[PDB]
PDB file of C-alpha atoms in Angstrom:
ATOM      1  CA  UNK A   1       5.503  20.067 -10.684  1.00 40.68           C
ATOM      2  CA  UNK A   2       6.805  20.355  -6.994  1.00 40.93           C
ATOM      3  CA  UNK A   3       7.894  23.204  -4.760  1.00 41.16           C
ATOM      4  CA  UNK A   4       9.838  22.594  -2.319  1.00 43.39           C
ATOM      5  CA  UNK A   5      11.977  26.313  -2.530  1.00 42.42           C
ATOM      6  CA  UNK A   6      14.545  27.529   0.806  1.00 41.69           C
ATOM      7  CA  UNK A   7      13.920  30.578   2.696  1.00 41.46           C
ATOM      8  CA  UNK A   8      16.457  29.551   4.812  1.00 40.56           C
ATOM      9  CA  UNK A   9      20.402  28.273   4.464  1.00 39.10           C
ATOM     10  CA  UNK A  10      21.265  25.734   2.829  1.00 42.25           C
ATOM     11  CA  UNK A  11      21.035  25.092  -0.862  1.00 41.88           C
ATOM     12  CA  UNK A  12      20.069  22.124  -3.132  1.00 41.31           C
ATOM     13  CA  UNK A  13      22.945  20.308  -4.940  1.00 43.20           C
ATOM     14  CA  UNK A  14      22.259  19.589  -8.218  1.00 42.97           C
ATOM     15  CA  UNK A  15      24.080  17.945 -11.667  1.00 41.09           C
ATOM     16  CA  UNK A  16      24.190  18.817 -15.115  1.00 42.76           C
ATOM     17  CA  UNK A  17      24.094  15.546 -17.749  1.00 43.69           C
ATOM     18  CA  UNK A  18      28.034  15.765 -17.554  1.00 43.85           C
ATOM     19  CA  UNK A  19      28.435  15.594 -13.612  1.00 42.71           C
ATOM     20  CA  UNK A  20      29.532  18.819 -13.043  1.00 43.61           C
ATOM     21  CA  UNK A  21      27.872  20.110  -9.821  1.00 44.26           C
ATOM     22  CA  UNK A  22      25.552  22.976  -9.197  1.00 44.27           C
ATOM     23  CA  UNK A  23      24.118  24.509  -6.003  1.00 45.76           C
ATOM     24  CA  UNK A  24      20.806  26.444  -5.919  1.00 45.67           C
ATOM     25  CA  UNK A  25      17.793  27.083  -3.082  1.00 45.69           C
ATOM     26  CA  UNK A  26      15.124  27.259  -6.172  1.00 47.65           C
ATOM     27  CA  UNK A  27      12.920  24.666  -5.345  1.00 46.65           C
ATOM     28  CA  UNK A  28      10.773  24.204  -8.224  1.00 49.49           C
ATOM     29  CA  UNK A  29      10.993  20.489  -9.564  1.00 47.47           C
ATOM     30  CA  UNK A  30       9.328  18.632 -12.489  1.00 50.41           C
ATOM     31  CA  UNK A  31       9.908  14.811 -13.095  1.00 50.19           C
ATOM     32  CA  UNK A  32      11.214  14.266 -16.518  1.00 48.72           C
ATOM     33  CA  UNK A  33      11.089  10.596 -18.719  1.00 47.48           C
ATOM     34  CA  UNK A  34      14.187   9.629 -17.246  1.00 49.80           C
ATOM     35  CA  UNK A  35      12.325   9.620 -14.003  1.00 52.59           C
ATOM     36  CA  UNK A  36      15.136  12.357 -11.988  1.00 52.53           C
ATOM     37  CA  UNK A  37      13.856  15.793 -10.671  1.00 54.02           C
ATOM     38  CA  UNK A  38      15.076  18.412 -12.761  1.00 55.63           C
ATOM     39  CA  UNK A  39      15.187  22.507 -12.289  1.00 53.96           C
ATOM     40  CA  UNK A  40      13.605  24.785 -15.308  1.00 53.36           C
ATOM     41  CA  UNK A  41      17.491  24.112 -16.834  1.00 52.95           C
ATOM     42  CA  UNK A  42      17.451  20.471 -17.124  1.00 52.09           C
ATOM     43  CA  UNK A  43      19.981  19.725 -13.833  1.00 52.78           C
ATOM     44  CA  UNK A  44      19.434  16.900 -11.700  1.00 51.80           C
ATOM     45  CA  UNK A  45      18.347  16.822  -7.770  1.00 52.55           C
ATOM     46  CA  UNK A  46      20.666  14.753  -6.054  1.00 54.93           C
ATOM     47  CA  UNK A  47      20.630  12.950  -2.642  1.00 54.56           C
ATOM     48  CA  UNK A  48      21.368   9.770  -1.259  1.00 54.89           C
ATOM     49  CA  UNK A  49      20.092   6.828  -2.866  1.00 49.88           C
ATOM     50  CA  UNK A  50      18.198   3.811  -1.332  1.00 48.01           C
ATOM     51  CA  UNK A  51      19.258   0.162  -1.079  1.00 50.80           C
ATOM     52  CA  UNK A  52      18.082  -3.111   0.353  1.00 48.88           C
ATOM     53  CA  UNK A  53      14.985  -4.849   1.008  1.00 44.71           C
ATOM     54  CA  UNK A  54      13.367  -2.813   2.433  1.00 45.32           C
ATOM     55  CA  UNK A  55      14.765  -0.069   0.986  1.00 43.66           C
ATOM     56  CA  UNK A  56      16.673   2.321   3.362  1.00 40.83           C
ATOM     57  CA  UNK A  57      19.204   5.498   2.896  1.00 41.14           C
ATOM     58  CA  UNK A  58      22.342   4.917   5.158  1.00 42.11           C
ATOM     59  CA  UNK A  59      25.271   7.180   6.588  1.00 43.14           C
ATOM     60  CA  UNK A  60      27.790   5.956   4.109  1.00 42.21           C
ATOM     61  CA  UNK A  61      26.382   7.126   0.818  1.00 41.85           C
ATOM     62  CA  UNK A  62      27.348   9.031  -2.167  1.00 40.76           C
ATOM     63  CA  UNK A  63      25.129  11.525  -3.152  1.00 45.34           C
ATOM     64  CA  UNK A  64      23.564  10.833  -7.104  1.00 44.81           C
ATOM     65  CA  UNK A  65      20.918  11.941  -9.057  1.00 45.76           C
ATOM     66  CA  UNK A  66      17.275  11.588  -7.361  1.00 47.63           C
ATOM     67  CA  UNK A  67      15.286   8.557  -9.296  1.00 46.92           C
ATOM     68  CA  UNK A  68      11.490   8.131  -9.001  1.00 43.86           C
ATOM     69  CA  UNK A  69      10.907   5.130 -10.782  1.00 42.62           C
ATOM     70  CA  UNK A  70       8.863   4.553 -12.145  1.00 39.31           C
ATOM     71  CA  UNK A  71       8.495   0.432 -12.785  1.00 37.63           C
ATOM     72  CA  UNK A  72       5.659  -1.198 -11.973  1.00 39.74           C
ATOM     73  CA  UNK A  73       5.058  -3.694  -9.228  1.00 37.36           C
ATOM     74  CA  UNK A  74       3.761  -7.016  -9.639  1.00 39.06           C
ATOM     75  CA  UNK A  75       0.253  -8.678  -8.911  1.00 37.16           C
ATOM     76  CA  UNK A  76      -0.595 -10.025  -5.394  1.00 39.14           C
ATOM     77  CA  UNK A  77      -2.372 -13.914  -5.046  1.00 40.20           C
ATOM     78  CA  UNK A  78      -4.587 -13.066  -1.818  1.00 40.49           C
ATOM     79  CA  UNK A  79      -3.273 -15.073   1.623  1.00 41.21           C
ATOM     80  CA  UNK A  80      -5.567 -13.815   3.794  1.00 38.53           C
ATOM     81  CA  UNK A  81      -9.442 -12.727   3.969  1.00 38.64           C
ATOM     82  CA  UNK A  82     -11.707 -11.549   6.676  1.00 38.86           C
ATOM     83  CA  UNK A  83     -15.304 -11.176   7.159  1.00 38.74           C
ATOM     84  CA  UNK A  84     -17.003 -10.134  10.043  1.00 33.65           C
ATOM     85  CA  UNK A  85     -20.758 -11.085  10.622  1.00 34.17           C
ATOM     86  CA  UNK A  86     -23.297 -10.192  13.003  1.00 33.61           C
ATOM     87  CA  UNK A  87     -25.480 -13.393  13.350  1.00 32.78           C
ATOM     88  CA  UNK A  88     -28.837 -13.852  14.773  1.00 33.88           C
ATOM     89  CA  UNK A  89     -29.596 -16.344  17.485  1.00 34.69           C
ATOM     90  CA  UNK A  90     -33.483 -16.211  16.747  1.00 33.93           C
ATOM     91  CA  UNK A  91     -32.964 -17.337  13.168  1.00 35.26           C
ATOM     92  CA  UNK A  92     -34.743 -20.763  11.768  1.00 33.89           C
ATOM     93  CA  UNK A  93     -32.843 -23.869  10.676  1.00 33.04           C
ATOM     94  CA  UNK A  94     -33.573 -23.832   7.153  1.00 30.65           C
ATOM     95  CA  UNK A  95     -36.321 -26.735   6.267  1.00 31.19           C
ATOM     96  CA  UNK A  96     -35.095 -27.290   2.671  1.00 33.72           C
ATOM     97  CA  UNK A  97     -32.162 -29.349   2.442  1.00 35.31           C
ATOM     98  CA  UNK A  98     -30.198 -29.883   1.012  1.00 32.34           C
ATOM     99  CA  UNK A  99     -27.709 -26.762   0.763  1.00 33.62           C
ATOM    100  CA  UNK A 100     -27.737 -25.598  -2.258  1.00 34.37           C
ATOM    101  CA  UNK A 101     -25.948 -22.153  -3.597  1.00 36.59           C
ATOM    102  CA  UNK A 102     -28.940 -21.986  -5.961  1.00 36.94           C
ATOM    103  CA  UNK A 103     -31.787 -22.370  -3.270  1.00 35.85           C
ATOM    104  CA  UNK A 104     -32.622 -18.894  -1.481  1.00 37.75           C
ATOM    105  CA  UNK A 105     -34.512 -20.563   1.416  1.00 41.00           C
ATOM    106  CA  UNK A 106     -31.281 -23.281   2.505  1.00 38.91           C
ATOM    107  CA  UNK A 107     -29.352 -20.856   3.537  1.00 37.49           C
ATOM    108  CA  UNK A 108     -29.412 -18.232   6.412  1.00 37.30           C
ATOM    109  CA  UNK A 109     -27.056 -15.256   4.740  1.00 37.13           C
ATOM    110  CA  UNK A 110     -24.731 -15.035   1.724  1.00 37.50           C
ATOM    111  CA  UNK A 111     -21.968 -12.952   1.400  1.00 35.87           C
ATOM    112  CA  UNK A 112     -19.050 -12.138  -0.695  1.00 39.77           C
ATOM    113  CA  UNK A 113     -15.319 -11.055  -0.897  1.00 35.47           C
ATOM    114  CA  UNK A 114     -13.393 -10.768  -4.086  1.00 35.58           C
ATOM    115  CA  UNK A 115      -9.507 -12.235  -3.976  1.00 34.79           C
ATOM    116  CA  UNK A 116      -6.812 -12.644  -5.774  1.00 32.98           C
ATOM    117  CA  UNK A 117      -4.760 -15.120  -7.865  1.00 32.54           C
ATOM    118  CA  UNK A 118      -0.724 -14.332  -8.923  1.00 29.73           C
ATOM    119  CA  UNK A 119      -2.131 -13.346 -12.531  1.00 35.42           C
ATOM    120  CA  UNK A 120      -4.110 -11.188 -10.683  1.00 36.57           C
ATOM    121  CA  UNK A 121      -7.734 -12.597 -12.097  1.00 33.32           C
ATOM    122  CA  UNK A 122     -10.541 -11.856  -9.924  1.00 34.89           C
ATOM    123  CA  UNK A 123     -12.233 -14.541  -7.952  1.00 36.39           C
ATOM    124  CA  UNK A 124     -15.675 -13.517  -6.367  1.00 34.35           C
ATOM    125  CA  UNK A 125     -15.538 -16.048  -3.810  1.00 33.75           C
ATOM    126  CA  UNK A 126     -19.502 -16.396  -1.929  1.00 35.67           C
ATOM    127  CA  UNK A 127     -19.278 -18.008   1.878  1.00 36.06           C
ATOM    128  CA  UNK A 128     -23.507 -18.857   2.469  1.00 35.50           C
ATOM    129  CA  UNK A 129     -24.122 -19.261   6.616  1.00 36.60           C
ATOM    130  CA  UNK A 130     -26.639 -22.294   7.629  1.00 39.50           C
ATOM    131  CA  UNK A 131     -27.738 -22.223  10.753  1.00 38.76           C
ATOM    132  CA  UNK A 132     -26.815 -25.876  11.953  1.00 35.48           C
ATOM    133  CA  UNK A 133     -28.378 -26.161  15.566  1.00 35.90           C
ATOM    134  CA  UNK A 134     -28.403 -23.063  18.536  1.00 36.76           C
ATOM    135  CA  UNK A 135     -25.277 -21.197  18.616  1.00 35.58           C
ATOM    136  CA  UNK A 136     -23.435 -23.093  14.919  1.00 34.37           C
ATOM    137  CA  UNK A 137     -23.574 -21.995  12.111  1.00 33.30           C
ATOM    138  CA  UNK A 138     -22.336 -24.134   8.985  1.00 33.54           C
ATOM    139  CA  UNK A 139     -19.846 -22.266   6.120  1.00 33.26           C
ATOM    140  CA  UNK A 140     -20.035 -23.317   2.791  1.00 31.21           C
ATOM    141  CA  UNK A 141     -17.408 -21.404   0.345  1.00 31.34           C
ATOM    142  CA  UNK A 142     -17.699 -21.404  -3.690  1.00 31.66           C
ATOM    143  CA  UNK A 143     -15.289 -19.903  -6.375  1.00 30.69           C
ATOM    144  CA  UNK A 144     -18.375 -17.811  -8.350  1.00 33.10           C
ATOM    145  CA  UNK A 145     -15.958 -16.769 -11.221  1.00 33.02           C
ATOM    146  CA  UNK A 146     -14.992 -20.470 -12.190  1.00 32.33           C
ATOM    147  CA  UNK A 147     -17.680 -22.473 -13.889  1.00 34.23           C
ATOM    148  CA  UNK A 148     -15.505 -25.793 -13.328  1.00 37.35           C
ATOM    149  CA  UNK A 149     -15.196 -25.520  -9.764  1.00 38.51           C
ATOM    150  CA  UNK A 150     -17.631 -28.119  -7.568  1.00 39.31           C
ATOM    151  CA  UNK A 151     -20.805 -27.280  -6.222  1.00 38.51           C
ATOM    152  CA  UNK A 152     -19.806 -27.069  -2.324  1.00 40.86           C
ATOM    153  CA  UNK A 153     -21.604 -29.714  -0.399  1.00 41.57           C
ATOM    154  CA  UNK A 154     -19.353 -29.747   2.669  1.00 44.56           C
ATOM    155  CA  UNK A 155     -18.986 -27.202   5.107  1.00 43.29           C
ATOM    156  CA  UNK A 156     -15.184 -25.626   4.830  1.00 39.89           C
ATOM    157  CA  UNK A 157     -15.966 -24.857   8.595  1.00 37.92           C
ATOM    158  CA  UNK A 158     -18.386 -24.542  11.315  1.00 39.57           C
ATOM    159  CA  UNK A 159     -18.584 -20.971  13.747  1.00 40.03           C
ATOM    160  CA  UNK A 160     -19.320 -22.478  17.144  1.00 43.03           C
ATOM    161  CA  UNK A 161     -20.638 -19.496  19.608  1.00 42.52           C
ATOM    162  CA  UNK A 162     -20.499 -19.403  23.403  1.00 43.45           C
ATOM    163  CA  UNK A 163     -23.353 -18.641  25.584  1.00 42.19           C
ATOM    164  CA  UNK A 164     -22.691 -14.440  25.268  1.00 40.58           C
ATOM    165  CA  UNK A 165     -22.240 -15.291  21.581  1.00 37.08           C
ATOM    166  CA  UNK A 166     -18.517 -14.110  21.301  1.00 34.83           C
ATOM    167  CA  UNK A 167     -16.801 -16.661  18.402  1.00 34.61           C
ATOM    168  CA  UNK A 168     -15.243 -19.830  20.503  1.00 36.22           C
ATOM    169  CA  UNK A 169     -14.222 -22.169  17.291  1.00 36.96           C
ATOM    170  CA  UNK A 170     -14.094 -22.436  13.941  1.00 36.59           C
ATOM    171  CA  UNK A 171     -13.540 -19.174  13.226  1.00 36.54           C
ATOM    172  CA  UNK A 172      -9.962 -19.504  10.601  1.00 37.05           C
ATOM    173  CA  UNK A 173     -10.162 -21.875   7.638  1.00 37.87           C
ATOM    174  CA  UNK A 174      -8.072 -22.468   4.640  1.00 38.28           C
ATOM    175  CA  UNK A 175      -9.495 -21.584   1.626  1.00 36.02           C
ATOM    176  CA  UNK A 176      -8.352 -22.157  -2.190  1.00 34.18           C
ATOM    177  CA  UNK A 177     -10.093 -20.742  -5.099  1.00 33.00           C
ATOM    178  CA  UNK A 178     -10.716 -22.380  -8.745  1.00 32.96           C
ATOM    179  CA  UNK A 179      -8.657 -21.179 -11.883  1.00 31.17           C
ATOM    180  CA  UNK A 180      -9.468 -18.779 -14.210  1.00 33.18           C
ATOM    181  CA  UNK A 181      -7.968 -18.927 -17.968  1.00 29.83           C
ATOM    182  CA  UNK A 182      -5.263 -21.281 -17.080  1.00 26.24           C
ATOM    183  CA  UNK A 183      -3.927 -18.989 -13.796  1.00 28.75           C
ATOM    184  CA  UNK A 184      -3.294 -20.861 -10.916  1.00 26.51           C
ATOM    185  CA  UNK A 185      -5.249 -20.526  -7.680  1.00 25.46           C
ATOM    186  CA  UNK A 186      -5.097 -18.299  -4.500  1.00 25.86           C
ATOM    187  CA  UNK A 187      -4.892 -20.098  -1.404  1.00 24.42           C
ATOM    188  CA  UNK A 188      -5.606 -17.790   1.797  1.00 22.15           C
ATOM    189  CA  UNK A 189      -6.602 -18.254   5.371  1.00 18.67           C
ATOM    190  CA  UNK A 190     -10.449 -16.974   5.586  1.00 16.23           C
ATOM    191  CA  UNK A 191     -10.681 -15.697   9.002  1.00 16.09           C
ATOM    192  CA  UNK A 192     -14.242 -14.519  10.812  1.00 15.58           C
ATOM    193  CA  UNK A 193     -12.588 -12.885  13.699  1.00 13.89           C
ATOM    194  CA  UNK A 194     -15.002 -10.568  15.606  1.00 16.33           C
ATOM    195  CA  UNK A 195     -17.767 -12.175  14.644  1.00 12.90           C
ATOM    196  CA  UNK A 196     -20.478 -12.544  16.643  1.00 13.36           C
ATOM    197  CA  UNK A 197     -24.058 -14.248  17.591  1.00 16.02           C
ATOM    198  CA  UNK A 198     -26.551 -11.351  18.743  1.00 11.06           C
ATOM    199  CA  UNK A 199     -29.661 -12.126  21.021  1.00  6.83           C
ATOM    200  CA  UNK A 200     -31.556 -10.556  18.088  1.00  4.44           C
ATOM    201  CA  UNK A 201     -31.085  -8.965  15.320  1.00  8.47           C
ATOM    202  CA  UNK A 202     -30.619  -9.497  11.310  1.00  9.13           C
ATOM    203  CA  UNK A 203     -27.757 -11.283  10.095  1.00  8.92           C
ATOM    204  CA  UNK A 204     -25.198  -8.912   8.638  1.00 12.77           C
ATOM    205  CA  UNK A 205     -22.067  -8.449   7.482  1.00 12.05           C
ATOM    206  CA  UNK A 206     -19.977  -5.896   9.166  1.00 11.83           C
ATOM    207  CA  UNK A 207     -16.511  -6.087   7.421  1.00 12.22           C
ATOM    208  CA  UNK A 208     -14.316  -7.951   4.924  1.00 12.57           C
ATOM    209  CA  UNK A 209     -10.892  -7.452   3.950  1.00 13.58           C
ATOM    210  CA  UNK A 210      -8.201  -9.344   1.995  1.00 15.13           C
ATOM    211  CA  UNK A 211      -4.783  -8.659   1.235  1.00 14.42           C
ATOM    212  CA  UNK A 212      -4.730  -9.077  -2.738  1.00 15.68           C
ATOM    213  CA  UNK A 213      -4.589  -7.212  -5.432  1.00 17.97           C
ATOM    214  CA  UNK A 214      -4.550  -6.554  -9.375  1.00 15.37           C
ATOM    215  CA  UNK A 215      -1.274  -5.067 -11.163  1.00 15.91           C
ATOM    216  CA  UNK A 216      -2.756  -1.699 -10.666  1.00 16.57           C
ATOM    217  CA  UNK A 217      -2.077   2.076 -11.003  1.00 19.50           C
ATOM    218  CA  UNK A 218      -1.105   3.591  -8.047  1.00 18.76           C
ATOM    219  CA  UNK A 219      -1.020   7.159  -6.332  1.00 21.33           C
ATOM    220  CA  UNK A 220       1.323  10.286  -4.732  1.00 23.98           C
ATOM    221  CA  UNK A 221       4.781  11.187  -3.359  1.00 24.80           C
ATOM    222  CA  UNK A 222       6.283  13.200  -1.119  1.00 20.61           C
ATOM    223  CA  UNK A 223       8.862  15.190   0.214  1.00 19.50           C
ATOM    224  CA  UNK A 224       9.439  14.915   4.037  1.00 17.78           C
ATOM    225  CA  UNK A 225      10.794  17.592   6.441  1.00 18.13           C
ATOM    226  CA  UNK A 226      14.258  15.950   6.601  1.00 20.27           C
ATOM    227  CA  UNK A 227      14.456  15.743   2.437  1.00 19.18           C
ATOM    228  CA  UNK A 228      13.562  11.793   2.530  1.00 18.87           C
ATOM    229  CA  UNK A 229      11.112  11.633  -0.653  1.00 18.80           C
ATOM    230  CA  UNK A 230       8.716   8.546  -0.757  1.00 17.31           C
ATOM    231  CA  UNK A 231       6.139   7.012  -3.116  1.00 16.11           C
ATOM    232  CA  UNK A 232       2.555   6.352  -2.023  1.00 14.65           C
ATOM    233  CA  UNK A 233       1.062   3.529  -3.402  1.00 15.94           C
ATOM    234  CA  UNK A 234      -2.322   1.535  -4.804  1.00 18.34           C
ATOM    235  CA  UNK A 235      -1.618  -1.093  -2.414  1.00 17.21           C
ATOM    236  CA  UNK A 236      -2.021   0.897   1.014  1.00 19.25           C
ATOM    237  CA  UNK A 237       2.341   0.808   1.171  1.00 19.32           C
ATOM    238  CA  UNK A 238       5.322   2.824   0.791  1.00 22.64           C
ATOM    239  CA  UNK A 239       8.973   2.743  -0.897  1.00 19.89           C
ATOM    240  CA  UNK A 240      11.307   5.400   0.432  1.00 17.45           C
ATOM    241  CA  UNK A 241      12.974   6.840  -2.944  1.00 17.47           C
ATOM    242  CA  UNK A 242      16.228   8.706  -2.050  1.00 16.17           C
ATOM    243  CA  UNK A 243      16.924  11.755   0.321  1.00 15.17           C
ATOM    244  CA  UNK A 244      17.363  15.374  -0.815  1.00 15.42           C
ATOM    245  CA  UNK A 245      21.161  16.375   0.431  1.00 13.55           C
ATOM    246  CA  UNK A 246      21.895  20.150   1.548  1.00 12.50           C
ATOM    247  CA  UNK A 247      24.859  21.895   1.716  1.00 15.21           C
ATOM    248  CA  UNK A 248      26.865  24.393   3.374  1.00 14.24           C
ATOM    249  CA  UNK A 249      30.025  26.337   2.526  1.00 14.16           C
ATOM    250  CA  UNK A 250      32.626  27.912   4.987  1.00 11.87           C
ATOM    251  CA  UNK A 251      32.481  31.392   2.924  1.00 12.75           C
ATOM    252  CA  UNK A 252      29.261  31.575   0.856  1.00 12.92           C
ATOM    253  CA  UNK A 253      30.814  34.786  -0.148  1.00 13.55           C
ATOM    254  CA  UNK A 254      33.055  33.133  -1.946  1.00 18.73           C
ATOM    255  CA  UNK A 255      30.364  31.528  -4.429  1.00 18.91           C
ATOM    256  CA  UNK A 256      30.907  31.926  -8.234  1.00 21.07           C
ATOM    257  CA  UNK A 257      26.985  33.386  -9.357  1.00 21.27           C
ATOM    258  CA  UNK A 258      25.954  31.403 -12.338  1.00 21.75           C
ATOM    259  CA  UNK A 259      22.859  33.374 -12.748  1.00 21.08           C
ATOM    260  CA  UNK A 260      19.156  33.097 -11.670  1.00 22.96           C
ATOM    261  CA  UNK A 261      19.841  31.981  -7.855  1.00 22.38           C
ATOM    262  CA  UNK A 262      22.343  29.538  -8.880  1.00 25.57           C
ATOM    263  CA  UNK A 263      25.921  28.955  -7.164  1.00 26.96           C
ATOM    264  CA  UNK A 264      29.384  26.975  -7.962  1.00 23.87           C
ATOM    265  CA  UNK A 265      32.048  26.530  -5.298  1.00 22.41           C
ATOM    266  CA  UNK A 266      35.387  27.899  -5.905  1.00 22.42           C
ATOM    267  CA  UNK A 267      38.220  27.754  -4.059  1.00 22.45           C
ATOM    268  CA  UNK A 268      37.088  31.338  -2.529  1.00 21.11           C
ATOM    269  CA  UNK A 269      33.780  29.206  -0.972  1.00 20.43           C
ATOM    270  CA  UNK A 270      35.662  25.663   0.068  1.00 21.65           C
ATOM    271  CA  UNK A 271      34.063  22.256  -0.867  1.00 22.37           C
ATOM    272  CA  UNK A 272      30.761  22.080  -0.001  1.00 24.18           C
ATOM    273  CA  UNK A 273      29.817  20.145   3.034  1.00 23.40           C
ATOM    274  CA  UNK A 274      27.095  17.591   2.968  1.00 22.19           C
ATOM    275  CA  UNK A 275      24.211  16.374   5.060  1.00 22.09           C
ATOM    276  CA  UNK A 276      20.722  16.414   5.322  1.00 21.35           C
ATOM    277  CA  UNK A 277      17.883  18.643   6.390  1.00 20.90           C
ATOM    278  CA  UNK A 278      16.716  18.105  10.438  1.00 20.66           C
ATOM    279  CA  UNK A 279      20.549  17.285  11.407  1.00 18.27           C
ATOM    280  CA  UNK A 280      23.922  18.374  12.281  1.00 17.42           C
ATOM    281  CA  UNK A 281      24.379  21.711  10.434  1.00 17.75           C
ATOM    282  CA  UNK A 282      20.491  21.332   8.837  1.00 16.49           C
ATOM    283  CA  UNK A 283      17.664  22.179  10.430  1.00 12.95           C
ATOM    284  CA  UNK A 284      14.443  20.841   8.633  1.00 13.63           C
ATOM    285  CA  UNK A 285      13.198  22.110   4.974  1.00 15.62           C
ATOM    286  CA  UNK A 286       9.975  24.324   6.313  1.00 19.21           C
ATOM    287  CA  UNK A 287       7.006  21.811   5.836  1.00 17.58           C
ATOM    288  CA  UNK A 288       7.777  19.510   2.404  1.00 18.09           C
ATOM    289  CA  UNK A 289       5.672  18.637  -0.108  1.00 16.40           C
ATOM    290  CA  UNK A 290       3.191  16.331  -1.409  1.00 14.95           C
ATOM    291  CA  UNK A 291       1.530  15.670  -5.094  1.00 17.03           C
ATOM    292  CA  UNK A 292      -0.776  13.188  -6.865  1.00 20.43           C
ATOM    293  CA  UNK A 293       0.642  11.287  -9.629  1.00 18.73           C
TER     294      UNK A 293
END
């Protein structure tokens, strides 16, 4: 249930079923199962609709009933990863060798970040640091959700560190996961930007991130000052979803009262003029409005 209700001038144009049109400054909105925003009488909000990729209202448009649809997105195969780490210069060069994802004491750190493939399975993907020599570190990657993939005995990359221990190579590597139940892999650039080799310390990590993501649920929407209403979603991004439309009448007088705060033009009123809240003959709607989904 939204509220977006005019103190000022201007009202909201609205449709019945048939596409006859209605005027009103009631603001109080539900969205029904055909996905439009509907007064307490079943008419429609209308506005300018959205087009293109990415979606954007233009000048040119015809004013129809608001949508907020409602269909799903699709799932996201990860492309990139980061993790940042915080590594220390005093630590040993492990004595048991060989590497081994198994054997606590051949490794200097383990960490982890979770990706993505286009079916959306998870991958728990473990990087393990050895300490090579002063100032490189070895990086050995392993898909931990696919009991097929190889035991990694080759270092997907080496983080070479400068004298003041700021990250000087090594530090972006391509990375590809194993399958899960016959889903193909993610590939994705691992990158360890930031990272850095401390004086002393304990080896740490600081961040991760990746850009993946499971056909999930999402969030809120919103009603801007200038009408524009936009959907907030799971996925830290945005879709713009139409624009509310005000208008204006030469002689409101003339209006034909249809009961509750409700208006039709008549040939007393004129056609009602279009445009939108924060320009030309609309200043903006008085703050909005925003609600979880």
């Amino acid at each position: 249930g939204l509220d977006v209700a005019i103190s000022q001038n201007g009202f909201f144009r609205l449709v019945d079923s048939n596409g006859s049109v209605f005027y009103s400054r009631n603001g109080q909105f539900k969205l029904d199962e055909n996905r439009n925003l509907v007064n307490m009488q079943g008419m429609q909000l209308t506005g300018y609709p959205a087009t293109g990729t990415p979606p954007t209202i233009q000048q040119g448009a015809n004013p129809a009933p608001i949508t907020i649809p409602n269909t799903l997105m699709a799932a996201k195969s990860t492309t990139t990863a980061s993790m940042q780490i915080n590594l220390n210069s005093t630590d040993p060069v492990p004595s048991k060798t060989p590497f081994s994802v198994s054997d606590a004491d051949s490794y200097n750190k383990k960490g982890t970040v979770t990706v993505y493939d286009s079916q959306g399975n998870a991958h728990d993907m473990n990087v393990y640091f050895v300490k090579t020599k002063d100032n490189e570190w070895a990086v050995y990657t392993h898909d931990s959700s696919d009991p097929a993939a190889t035991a990694p005995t080759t270092a997907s990359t080496t983080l070479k560190f400068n004298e003041n221990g700021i990250l000087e190579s090594g530090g972006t590597v391509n990375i590809t996961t194993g399958t899960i139940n016959g889903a193909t892999a993610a590939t994705f650039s691992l990158s360890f930007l930031n990272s850095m080799q401390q004086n002393t310390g304990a080896n740490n990590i600081v961040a991760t991130n990746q850009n993946g993501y499971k056909p999930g649920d999402l969030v809120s929407y919103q009603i801007n000052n200038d009408g524009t209403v936009v959907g907030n979603y799971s996925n830290e991004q945005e879709q713009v979803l139409g624009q509310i439309v005000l208008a204006n009448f030469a002689n409101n007088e003339g209006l034909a009262s249809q009961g509750d705060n409700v208006w039709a033009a008549t040939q007393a009123s004129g056609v009602a003029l279009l445009g939108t809240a924060g320009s030309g003959n609309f200043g903006k709607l008085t703050n909005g409005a925003l609600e979880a989904s």
